[PDB]
Short mmCIF file of N, CA, C and O and ligand atoms in Angstrom, two decimals:
data_model
loop_
_atom_site.label_atom_id
_atom_site.label_comp_id
_atom_site.label_asym_id
_atom_site.label_seq_id
_atom_site.Cartn_x
_atom_site.Cartn_y
_atom_site.Cartn_z
N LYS T 1 -37.73 -24.66 -27.15
CA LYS T 1 -37.50 -23.63 -26.25
C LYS T 1 -38.22 -22.44 -26.13
O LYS T 1 -38.63 -22.59 -27.37
N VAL T 2 -38.62 -22.47 -24.99
CA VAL T 2 -39.29 -20.77 -25.12
C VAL T 2 -38.37 -19.62 -24.72
O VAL T 2 -37.76 -19.40 -23.54
N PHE T 3 -38.79 -19.04 -25.70
CA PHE T 3 -37.53 -17.75 -25.68
C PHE T 3 -38.11 -16.37 -24.71
O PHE T 3 -39.32 -16.24 -24.84
N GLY T 4 -37.43 -15.61 -24.21
CA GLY T 4 -38.13 -14.18 -23.62
C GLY T 4 -38.40 -13.57 -24.38
O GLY T 4 -37.07 -13.99 -25.76
N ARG T 5 -38.92 -12.44 -24.21
CA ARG T 5 -38.46 -11.21 -25.68
C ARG T 5 -37.65 -10.58 -25.89
O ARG T 5 -37.40 -10.75 -27.08
N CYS T 6 -36.57 -10.33 -24.73
CA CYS T 6 -35.98 -9.34 -24.86
C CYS T 6 -34.60 -10.80 -25.44
O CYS T 6 -33.81 -10.59 -26.56
N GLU T 7 -34.83 -11.47 -24.72
CA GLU T 7 -33.80 -12.76 -25.68
C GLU T 7 -33.80 -13.46 -27.21
O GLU T 7 -32.80 -13.01 -27.56
N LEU T 8 -34.93 -13.29 -27.43
CA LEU T 8 -34.91 -13.52 -28.90
C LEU T 8 -34.73 -12.34 -29.78
O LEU T 8 -34.40 -12.07 -30.77
N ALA T 9 -35.01 -11.24 -29.25
CA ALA T 9 -34.62 -9.91 -30.21
C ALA T 9 -32.88 -9.72 -30.40
O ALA T 9 -32.92 -9.81 -31.51
N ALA T 10 -32.70 -10.51 -29.17
CA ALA T 10 -30.74 -10.49 -29.38
C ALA T 10 -30.63 -11.40 -30.07
O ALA T 10 -29.86 -10.67 -31.03
N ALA T 11 -31.08 -12.38 -30.07
CA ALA T 11 -30.81 -13.75 -31.02
C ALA T 11 -31.16 -13.30 -32.57
O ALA T 11 -30.20 -13.69 -33.79
N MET T 12 -32.44 -12.78 -32.65
CA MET T 12 -32.68 -12.32 -34.26
C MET T 12 -31.75 -11.23 -34.54
O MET T 12 -31.17 -11.34 -35.96
N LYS T 13 -31.07 -10.59 -33.50
CA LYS T 13 -29.86 -9.48 -34.42
C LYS T 13 -28.68 -9.86 -34.78
O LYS T 13 -27.97 -9.54 -35.93
N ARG T 14 -28.65 -10.81 -33.80
CA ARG T 14 -27.62 -11.30 -34.02
C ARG T 14 -26.96 -12.41 -34.92
O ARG T 14 -25.89 -12.26 -35.95
N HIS T 15 -28.41 -12.33 -35.58
CA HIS T 15 -28.97 -13.55 -37.06
C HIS T 15 -28.88 -12.31 -37.93
O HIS T 15 -29.17 -12.91 -39.35
N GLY T 16 -29.00 -11.47 -38.09
CA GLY T 16 -28.96 -10.11 -39.25
C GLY T 16 -30.68 -9.89 -39.50
O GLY T 16 -30.81 -9.62 -40.68
N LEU T 17 -31.60 -9.83 -39.01
CA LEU T 17 -32.99 -9.67 -39.26
C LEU T 17 -33.36 -7.80 -38.86
O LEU T 17 -34.36 -7.44 -39.63
N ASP T 18 -32.75 -7.60 -38.17
CA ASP T 18 -33.16 -5.98 -38.28
C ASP T 18 -32.59 -5.45 -39.52
O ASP T 18 -31.61 -5.43 -39.81
N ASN T 19 -33.57 -4.75 -39.66
CA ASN T 19 -33.81 -3.82 -41.22
C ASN T 19 -33.81 -4.79 -41.91
O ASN T 19 -33.33 -4.04 -43.42
N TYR T 20 -34.02 -6.33 -42.17
CA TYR T 20 -33.50 -7.19 -43.48
C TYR T 20 -35.06 -6.75 -44.38
O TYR T 20 -36.26 -6.72 -43.76
N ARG T 21 -34.65 -6.36 -45.73
CA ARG T 21 -35.67 -5.93 -46.40
C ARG T 21 -36.64 -4.44 -45.92
O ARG T 21 -37.70 -4.39 -45.96
N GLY T 22 -36.31 -3.98 -45.46
CA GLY T 22 -36.58 -3.05 -44.51
C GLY T 22 -37.45 -2.97 -43.29
O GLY T 22 -38.06 -1.66 -43.26
N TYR T 23 -37.54 -4.05 -43.04
CA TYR T 23 -38.23 -4.24 -41.44
C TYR T 23 -37.64 -4.28 -40.30
O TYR T 23 -36.61 -5.48 -40.00
N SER T 24 -37.97 -3.36 -39.29
CA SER T 24 -37.40 -3.05 -38.16
C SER T 24 -37.66 -4.44 -37.25
O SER T 24 -38.27 -4.88 -37.71
N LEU T 25 -36.37 -4.44 -36.06
CA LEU T 25 -36.51 -5.98 -35.41
C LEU T 25 -37.87 -6.33 -34.91
O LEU T 25 -38.04 -7.42 -34.83
N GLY T 26 -38.43 -4.97 -34.10
CA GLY T 26 -39.71 -5.21 -33.56
C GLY T 26 -40.97 -5.89 -34.68
O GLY T 26 -41.79 -6.76 -34.08
N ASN T 27 -40.60 -5.81 -35.78
CA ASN T 27 -41.60 -6.35 -36.31
C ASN T 27 -41.35 -7.98 -36.36
O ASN T 27 -42.62 -8.88 -36.36
N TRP T 28 -40.36 -8.51 -36.34
CA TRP T 28 -40.16 -9.99 -36.57
C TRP T 28 -40.19 -10.45 -35.08
O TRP T 28 -41.04 -11.93 -35.15
N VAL T 29 -40.07 -9.46 -34.00
CA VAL T 29 -40.36 -10.27 -32.49
C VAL T 29 -41.88 -9.99 -32.76
O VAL T 29 -42.21 -10.93 -31.79
N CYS T 30 -42.79 -9.16 -33.01
CA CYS T 30 -44.31 -9.05 -32.64
C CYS T 30 -44.73 -9.97 -33.62
O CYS T 30 -45.56 -11.22 -33.28
N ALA T 31 -44.49 -10.68 -34.78
CA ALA T 31 -44.63 -11.92 -35.12
C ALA T 31 -44.31 -12.81 -34.98
O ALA T 31 -45.38 -14.02 -35.23
N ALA T 32 -43.36 -13.47 -34.27
CA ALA T 32 -42.86 -14.44 -33.68
C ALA T 32 -43.63 -14.70 -32.09
O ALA T 32 -44.46 -16.27 -32.10
N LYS T 33 -44.33 -13.73 -31.61
CA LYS T 33 -44.99 -14.01 -30.57
C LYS T 33 -46.32 -14.39 -30.95
O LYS T 33 -47.30 -15.09 -30.60
N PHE T 34 -46.75 -13.60 -31.90
CA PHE T 34 -48.54 -13.89 -32.23
C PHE T 34 -48.45 -15.61 -33.16
O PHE T 34 -49.54 -16.08 -33.22
N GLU T 35 -47.44 -15.79 -33.78
CA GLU T 35 -47.67 -17.59 -34.31
C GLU T 35 -47.12 -18.24 -33.35
O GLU T 35 -47.93 -19.01 -33.67
N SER T 36 -46.27 -18.18 -32.69
CA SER T 36 -45.70 -19.43 -31.75
C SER T 36 -45.43 -19.26 -30.47
O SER T 36 -44.99 -20.15 -29.70
N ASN T 37 -45.95 -17.95 -29.76
CA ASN T 37 -45.19 -17.53 -28.14
C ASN T 37 -44.67 -17.94 -28.20
O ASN T 37 -44.32 -18.39 -26.96
N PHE T 38 -43.60 -17.32 -28.82
CA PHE T 38 -42.15 -17.70 -28.77
C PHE T 38 -41.68 -19.25 -28.33
O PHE T 38 -40.58 -19.13 -27.64
N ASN T 39 -42.49 -19.92 -28.77
CA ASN T 39 -41.78 -21.38 -28.62
C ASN T 39 -41.72 -22.05 -29.87
O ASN T 39 -42.15 -22.12 -30.91
N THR T 40 -40.43 -22.51 -29.85
CA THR T 40 -39.33 -23.25 -31.23
C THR T 40 -40.34 -24.12 -31.69
O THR T 40 -40.15 -24.88 -32.32
N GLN T 41 -40.86 -25.45 -30.54
CA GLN T 41 -41.48 -26.51 -30.79
C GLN T 41 -42.82 -26.31 -31.40
O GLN T 41 -43.29 -27.82 -31.75
N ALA T 42 -43.43 -25.56 -31.79
CA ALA T 42 -44.83 -25.27 -31.80
C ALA T 42 -45.25 -25.61 -33.18
O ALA T 42 -44.25 -25.55 -33.92
N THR T 43 -46.28 -26.69 -33.60
CA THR T 43 -46.80 -26.91 -34.76
C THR T 43 -48.32 -26.68 -34.72
O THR T 43 -48.63 -26.56 -33.80
N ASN T 44 -48.85 -27.02 -36.22
CA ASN T 44 -49.95 -26.68 -36.41
C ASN T 44 -50.68 -27.41 -37.67
O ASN T 44 -49.83 -26.94 -38.60
N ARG T 45 -51.83 -27.47 -37.40
CA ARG T 45 -51.71 -28.64 -38.70
C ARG T 45 -53.01 -28.06 -39.73
O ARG T 45 -53.85 -27.50 -38.78
N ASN T 46 -52.74 -27.68 -41.08
CA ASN T 46 -53.58 -27.35 -41.59
C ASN T 46 -55.00 -27.17 -42.37
O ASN T 46 -54.62 -28.63 -42.36
N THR T 47 -55.77 -26.91 -42.64
CA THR T 47 -56.94 -27.51 -43.60
C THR T 47 -56.57 -27.77 -44.94
O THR T 47 -57.89 -27.84 -45.28
N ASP T 48 -55.81 -27.67 -45.06
CA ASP T 48 -55.53 -28.11 -46.85
C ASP T 48 -54.30 -29.35 -46.79
O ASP T 48 -53.73 -29.52 -47.96
N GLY T 49 -53.85 -29.70 -45.61
CA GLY T 49 -52.76 -31.15 -45.39
C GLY T 49 -51.52 -31.24 -44.83
O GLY T 49 -51.14 -31.58 -44.01
N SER T 50 -51.12 -29.39 -45.18
CA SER T 50 -50.01 -29.39 -44.84
C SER T 50 -49.86 -28.47 -43.31
O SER T 50 -50.85 -28.88 -42.85
N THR T 51 -48.55 -28.42 -42.47
CA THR T 51 -48.69 -27.94 -41.35
C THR T 51 -46.98 -26.73 -41.37
O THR T 51 -46.13 -26.51 -42.15
N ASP T 52 -47.34 -26.09 -40.40
CA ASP T 52 -46.78 -25.21 -39.58
C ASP T 52 -45.75 -25.64 -39.08
O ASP T 52 -46.35 -25.73 -37.63
N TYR T 53 -44.46 -25.07 -38.62
CA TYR T 53 -42.95 -25.40 -37.68
C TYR T 53 -42.54 -24.32 -37.26
O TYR T 53 -41.92 -23.43 -37.84
N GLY T 54 -42.33 -24.09 -35.85
CA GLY T 54 -41.51 -23.15 -35.54
C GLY T 54 -41.90 -22.03 -34.99
O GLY T 54 -43.24 -21.78 -34.90
N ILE T 55 -41.08 -21.05 -35.02
CA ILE T 55 -41.24 -19.91 -34.05
C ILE T 55 -41.66 -18.94 -35.07
O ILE T 55 -42.07 -17.88 -34.64
N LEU T 56 -41.73 -19.29 -36.20
CA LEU T 56 -42.20 -18.30 -37.43
C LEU T 56 -43.14 -19.26 -38.41
O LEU T 56 -43.75 -18.45 -39.04
N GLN T 57 -43.21 -20.37 -37.54
CA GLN T 57 -44.83 -20.94 -38.24
C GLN T 57 -44.53 -20.97 -39.83
O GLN T 57 -45.47 -20.88 -40.54
N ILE T 58 -43.32 -21.65 -40.39
CA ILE T 58 -43.01 -21.80 -41.62
C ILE T 58 -43.88 -23.06 -42.20
O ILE T 58 -44.07 -24.39 -41.44
N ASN T 59 -44.22 -23.02 -43.61
CA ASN T 59 -45.54 -23.79 -44.05
C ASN T 59 -44.77 -25.00 -44.66
O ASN T 59 -43.98 -24.85 -45.74
N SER T 60 -45.28 -26.20 -44.55
CA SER T 60 -44.54 -27.52 -45.44
C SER T 60 -45.37 -27.52 -47.09
O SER T 60 -44.46 -28.17 -47.59
N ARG T 61 -46.20 -26.79 -47.25
CA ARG T 61 -46.70 -26.99 -48.87
C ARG T 61 -45.33 -26.01 -49.75
O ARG T 61 -45.51 -26.55 -51.09
N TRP T 62 -45.03 -25.25 -49.67
CA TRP T 62 -44.13 -24.59 -50.19
C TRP T 62 -42.34 -24.21 -49.60
O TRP T 62 -41.66 -25.01 -50.47
N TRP T 63 -42.50 -24.42 -48.51
CA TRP T 63 -41.08 -24.57 -47.89
C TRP T 63 -39.74 -25.48 -47.48
O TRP T 63 -38.42 -25.05 -47.62
N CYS T 64 -40.45 -26.28 -46.71
CA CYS T 64 -39.61 -27.45 -45.66
C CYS T 64 -40.57 -28.67 -46.27
O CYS T 64 -41.57 -28.94 -46.65
N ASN T 65 -39.41 -29.74 -45.91
CA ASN T 65 -39.97 -31.06 -46.43
C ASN T 65 -40.28 -32.00 -44.99
O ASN T 65 -39.66 -32.43 -44.40
N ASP T 66 -41.80 -32.30 -45.36
CA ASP T 66 -41.73 -33.17 -43.78
C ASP T 66 -42.52 -34.48 -44.59
O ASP T 66 -42.73 -35.39 -43.31
N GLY T 67 -41.96 -34.91 -45.20
CA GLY T 67 -42.62 -36.60 -45.86
C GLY T 67 -44.05 -36.74 -45.18
O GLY T 67 -45.00 -37.85 -46.01
N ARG T 68 -44.86 -36.11 -45.47
CA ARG T 68 -46.45 -36.19 -46.02
C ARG T 68 -47.65 -35.05 -46.25
O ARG T 68 -48.45 -35.10 -45.65
N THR T 69 -46.53 -34.44 -47.03
CA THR T 69 -47.60 -33.04 -47.66
C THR T 69 -47.43 -32.97 -48.80
O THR T 69 -46.47 -32.71 -49.93
N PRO T 70 -48.42 -34.35 -50.00
CA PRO T 70 -48.13 -34.51 -51.51
C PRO T 70 -47.80 -33.62 -51.93
O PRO T 70 -48.98 -32.61 -52.11
N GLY T 71 -47.60 -33.44 -53.50
CA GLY T 71 -47.63 -32.41 -54.18
C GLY T 71 -46.68 -30.85 -53.45
O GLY T 71 -46.74 -29.74 -54.46
N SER T 72 -46.04 -30.86 -52.50
CA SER T 72 -45.55 -29.93 -51.97
C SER T 72 -43.71 -29.82 -52.40
O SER T 72 -43.31 -30.49 -53.18
N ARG T 73 -43.61 -28.40 -52.59
CA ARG T 73 -42.16 -28.01 -52.86
C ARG T 73 -41.50 -27.97 -51.41
O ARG T 73 -42.10 -28.22 -50.09
N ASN T 74 -39.86 -27.68 -51.46
CA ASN T 74 -39.02 -27.49 -50.35
C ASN T 74 -38.28 -26.59 -50.91
O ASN T 74 -36.87 -26.56 -50.87
N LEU T 75 -38.59 -25.61 -50.69
CA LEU T 75 -37.51 -23.94 -51.25
C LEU T 75 -36.35 -23.32 -50.00
O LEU T 75 -35.68 -22.96 -51.01
N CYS T 76 -36.63 -23.67 -48.93
CA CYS T 76 -35.75 -23.83 -48.71
C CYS T 76 -34.78 -25.32 -48.26
O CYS T 76 -33.63 -24.78 -47.49
N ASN T 77 -35.41 -25.96 -48.76
CA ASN T 77 -34.24 -27.11 -48.48
C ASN T 77 -33.79 -27.64 -47.89
O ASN T 77 -32.59 -27.78 -47.18
N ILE T 78 -34.88 -27.77 -46.50
CA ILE T 78 -34.48 -28.35 -45.05
C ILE T 78 -35.66 -29.30 -45.10
O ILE T 78 -36.56 -29.21 -45.47
N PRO T 79 -35.42 -30.22 -43.70
CA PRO T 79 -36.42 -31.17 -43.35
C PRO T 79 -37.53 -30.06 -42.32
O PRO T 79 -36.59 -29.43 -41.65
N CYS T 80 -38.57 -30.39 -42.26
CA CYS T 80 -39.32 -29.68 -41.25
C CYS T 80 -38.72 -29.33 -39.93
O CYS T 80 -39.05 -28.06 -39.16
N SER T 81 -38.47 -30.02 -39.48
CA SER T 81 -37.94 -30.67 -38.48
C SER T 81 -36.84 -30.09 -37.63
O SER T 81 -36.29 -29.53 -36.54
N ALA T 82 -35.87 -29.23 -38.75
CA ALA T 82 -34.88 -28.27 -38.18
C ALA T 82 -35.46 -27.01 -37.95
O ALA T 82 -34.44 -25.98 -37.25
N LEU T 83 -36.36 -26.91 -37.94
CA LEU T 83 -37.36 -25.84 -37.68
C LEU T 83 -37.67 -25.39 -36.37
O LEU T 83 -38.20 -24.57 -35.48
N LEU T 84 -37.59 -26.46 -35.49
CA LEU T 84 -38.18 -26.74 -34.48
C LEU T 84 -37.06 -26.86 -33.34
O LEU T 84 -37.10 -27.04 -32.25
N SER T 85 -36.03 -26.32 -34.03
CA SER T 85 -34.42 -26.56 -33.10
C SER T 85 -34.51 -25.26 -32.12
O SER T 85 -35.25 -24.01 -32.37
N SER T 86 -33.67 -25.40 -31.24
CA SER T 86 -33.32 -24.31 -29.89
C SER T 86 -32.57 -23.28 -30.51
O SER T 86 -32.31 -22.23 -29.90
N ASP T 87 -31.93 -23.53 -31.45
CA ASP T 87 -31.01 -22.57 -32.47
C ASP T 87 -31.99 -22.37 -33.53
O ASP T 87 -32.64 -22.99 -34.25
N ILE T 88 -32.08 -21.04 -33.54
CA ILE T 88 -32.63 -20.25 -34.64
C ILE T 88 -31.81 -20.54 -35.97
O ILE T 88 -32.89 -19.73 -37.04
N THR T 89 -31.33 -20.16 -36.53
CA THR T 89 -30.57 -20.28 -37.47
C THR T 89 -31.29 -21.01 -38.66
O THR T 89 -31.10 -20.23 -39.78
N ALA T 90 -31.79 -21.91 -38.89
CA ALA T 90 -32.58 -22.31 -39.73
C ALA T 90 -33.73 -21.55 -40.32
O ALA T 90 -34.38 -21.61 -41.33
N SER T 91 -34.83 -21.62 -39.03
CA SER T 91 -35.93 -20.67 -39.50
C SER T 91 -35.91 -18.86 -39.67
O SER T 91 -36.17 -18.66 -41.10
N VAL T 92 -34.52 -18.35 -39.62
CA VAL T 92 -34.10 -17.32 -39.80
C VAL T 92 -33.39 -17.38 -41.13
O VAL T 92 -34.36 -16.03 -42.10
N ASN T 93 -32.64 -18.34 -41.85
CA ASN T 93 -32.47 -18.38 -43.26
C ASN T 93 -33.38 -18.54 -43.95
O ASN T 93 -33.63 -18.16 -44.95
N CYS T 94 -34.27 -19.29 -43.84
CA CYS T 94 -36.06 -19.60 -44.76
C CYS T 94 -36.77 -18.54 -44.15
O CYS T 94 -37.18 -18.37 -45.30
N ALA T 95 -37.26 -17.64 -43.28
CA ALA T 95 -37.53 -16.44 -43.41
C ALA T 95 -37.08 -15.60 -44.12
O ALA T 95 -37.79 -14.67 -44.94
N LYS T 96 -35.66 -15.27 -44.58
CA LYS T 96 -35.06 -14.55 -45.25
C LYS T 96 -35.80 -14.86 -46.33
O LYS T 96 -35.63 -13.84 -47.66
N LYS T 97 -35.68 -16.16 -47.24
CA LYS T 97 -36.06 -16.37 -48.50
C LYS T 97 -37.62 -16.06 -48.88
O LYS T 97 -37.73 -15.47 -49.90
N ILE T 98 -38.20 -16.22 -47.68
CA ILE T 98 -39.55 -15.99 -47.44
C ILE T 98 -40.27 -14.57 -47.88
O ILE T 98 -40.95 -14.17 -48.91
N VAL T 99 -39.64 -13.72 -46.93
CA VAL T 99 -39.82 -12.27 -46.98
C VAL T 99 -39.35 -11.79 -48.80
O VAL T 99 -39.75 -10.16 -48.73
N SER T 100 -38.49 -12.24 -49.00
CA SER T 100 -38.20 -11.67 -50.03
C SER T 100 -38.37 -12.16 -51.41
O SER T 100 -38.58 -11.48 -52.40
N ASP T 101 -39.54 -13.11 -51.48
CA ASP T 101 -40.33 -13.45 -52.26
C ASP T 101 -41.35 -12.52 -52.90
O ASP T 101 -42.07 -12.61 -54.21
N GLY T 102 -41.90 -11.30 -52.53
CA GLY T 102 -42.44 -10.11 -52.93
C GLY T 102 -43.46 -10.00 -52.22
O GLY T 102 -43.76 -8.43 -52.52
N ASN T 103 -44.24 -10.29 -51.43
CA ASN T 103 -45.52 -9.79 -50.32
C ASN T 103 -44.64 -9.53 -49.41
O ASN T 103 -45.55 -8.90 -48.27
N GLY T 104 -43.79 -9.62 -49.06
CA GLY T 104 -42.79 -9.23 -47.83
C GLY T 104 -43.37 -9.79 -46.52
O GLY T 104 -43.74 -11.38 -47.05
N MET T 105 -43.63 -9.31 -45.79
CA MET T 105 -43.62 -9.60 -44.37
C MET T 105 -45.78 -10.39 -44.20
O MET T 105 -45.83 -10.96 -43.42
N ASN T 106 -46.34 -9.43 -45.50
CA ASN T 106 -47.42 -9.86 -45.38
C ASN T 106 -47.85 -11.76 -45.65
O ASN T 106 -49.19 -12.17 -45.44
N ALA T 107 -46.76 -12.64 -46.02
CA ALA T 107 -46.77 -13.70 -45.93
C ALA T 107 -47.27 -14.32 -44.69
O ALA T 107 -47.74 -15.71 -44.68
N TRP T 108 -46.97 -14.01 -43.42
CA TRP T 108 -47.16 -14.48 -42.54
C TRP T 108 -48.73 -13.71 -41.99
O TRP T 108 -48.87 -12.33 -41.57
N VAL T 109 -49.60 -13.92 -41.71
CA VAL T 109 -50.90 -14.26 -41.74
C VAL T 109 -51.19 -13.68 -40.16
O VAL T 109 -51.97 -12.14 -40.04
N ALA T 110 -50.80 -13.68 -38.94
CA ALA T 110 -50.69 -12.96 -37.54
C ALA T 110 -50.08 -11.75 -37.87
O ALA T 110 -50.11 -10.74 -37.39
N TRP T 111 -48.64 -11.31 -38.71
CA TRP T 111 -48.02 -10.14 -38.67
C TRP T 111 -49.20 -9.13 -39.68
O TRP T 111 -49.24 -8.06 -39.10
N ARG T 112 -50.01 -9.47 -40.52
CA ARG T 112 -50.61 -8.40 -41.39
C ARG T 112 -51.67 -8.35 -40.72
O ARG T 112 -52.31 -7.18 -40.34
N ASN T 113 -52.46 -8.65 -39.56
CA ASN T 113 -53.52 -8.75 -39.18
C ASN T 113 -53.05 -8.07 -37.49
O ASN T 113 -54.46 -8.03 -36.67
N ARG T 114 -51.91 -8.44 -37.01
CA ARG T 114 -51.81 -8.26 -35.43
C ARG T 114 -50.74 -7.26 -35.32
O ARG T 114 -50.19 -6.52 -34.00
N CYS T 115 -49.64 -6.80 -36.09
CA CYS T 115 -48.45 -6.12 -36.12
C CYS T 115 -48.48 -5.45 -36.82
O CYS T 115 -48.34 -3.67 -36.69
N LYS T 116 -48.88 -5.43 -38.51
CA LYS T 116 -48.86 -4.31 -39.61
C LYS T 116 -49.67 -3.28 -38.89
O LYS T 116 -50.68 -2.91 -38.54
N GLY T 117 -48.69 -1.79 -38.92
CA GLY T 117 -49.42 -0.28 -38.69
C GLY T 117 -49.98 -0.34 -37.13
O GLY T 117 -50.46 0.66 -36.73
N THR T 118 -49.09 -0.94 -36.11
CA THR T 118 -49.46 -0.75 -35.06
C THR T 118 -47.58 -0.27 -34.69
O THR T 118 -46.60 -0.35 -35.76
N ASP T 119 -47.95 0.55 -33.30
CA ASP T 119 -46.14 0.56 -32.60
C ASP T 119 -45.39 -0.39 -32.47
O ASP T 119 -45.22 -0.77 -31.11
N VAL T 120 -44.52 -1.04 -33.86
CA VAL T 120 -44.04 -2.03 -33.16
C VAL T 120 -42.70 -2.47 -32.58
O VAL T 120 -42.30 -3.18 -31.79
N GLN T 121 -41.96 -0.86 -32.45
CA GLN T 121 -41.03 -0.44 -31.12
C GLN T 121 -41.13 -1.16 -29.54
O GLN T 121 -40.32 -1.41 -29.65
N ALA T 122 -42.62 -0.53 -29.73
CA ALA T 122 -43.01 -1.46 -28.13
C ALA T 122 -42.41 -2.92 -27.99
O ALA T 122 -41.85 -3.28 -26.74
N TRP T 123 -41.95 -3.45 -29.00
CA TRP T 123 -41.93 -4.97 -28.69
C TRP T 123 -39.94 -5.01 -28.64
O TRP T 123 -39.50 -6.29 -28.08
N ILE T 124 -39.21 -4.30 -28.41
CA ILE T 124 -37.88 -4.57 -28.26
C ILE T 124 -37.40 -2.85 -27.27
O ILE T 124 -36.64 -3.07 -27.18
N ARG T 125 -38.30 -2.33 -26.37
CA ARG T 125 -38.31 -1.37 -25.49
C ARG T 125 -38.14 -2.08 -24.42
O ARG T 125 -38.18 -3.12 -23.87
N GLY T 126 -37.02 -1.72 -23.97
CA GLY T 126 -36.35 -2.21 -22.24
C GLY T 126 -35.07 -3.09 -22.90
O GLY T 126 -34.46 -3.28 -21.62
N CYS T 127 -34.68 -3.64 -23.97
CA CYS T 127 -33.76 -4.68 -24.18
C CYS T 127 -32.57 -3.91 -24.43
O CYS T 127 -32.27 -2.90 -24.97
N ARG T 128 -31.25 -4.32 -24.16
CA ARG T 128 -30.21 -4.37 -24.33
C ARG T 128 -29.62 -5.19 -25.53
O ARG T 128 -29.58 -6.04 -25.74
N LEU T 129 -29.44 -4.36 -26.75
CA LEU T 129 -29.24 -4.61 -28.14
C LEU T 129 -28.39 -4.61 -28.55
O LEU T 129 -27.23 -5.18 -29.35
CL1 CL D 1 -41.66 -5.29 -48.50
NA1 NA D 2 -42.63 -29.73 -48.69
#
C-alpha cells in the first residue's frame, strides 16, 4: 500500500507514535517519506548482505529474520515479510524497540540527514488528527 501523508499521520497516531520517546508525530512522517516514499512494500539490499524492509526500512542484520542474512539477530522476533503489510502494526512495534535502543531516531540515516533540525511540524500541517 502507498499511504497518503495525512492518512499515514493518522495511522501512526492511532498506533501511539505521537511523542513516543519525545519524538513528535512529524518526525515519524518525515522519516517514512524519505525512507520508503510512503510505500509499505519497499525493499532495498545493502552492501553487507542485509536487506531493509517496509515503510521505515528496518534492517535484517539486527531486527527481523529473512532467512538469508547469516549471523544476524531477530530482536523484534518477526519475519521481515511482516514489515511489508498494509497494516503497519508490526513496523510500529519494532520501531518502538529501535528508538529505545539508545541513539534515538539517529538509527534512521534518512531522518538524521533530511529531517533532524528542520521544521517537521510541516509534515502534519492541514491534517485532521
Ligand atoms: Cl532521544
Ligand atoms: Na536477522
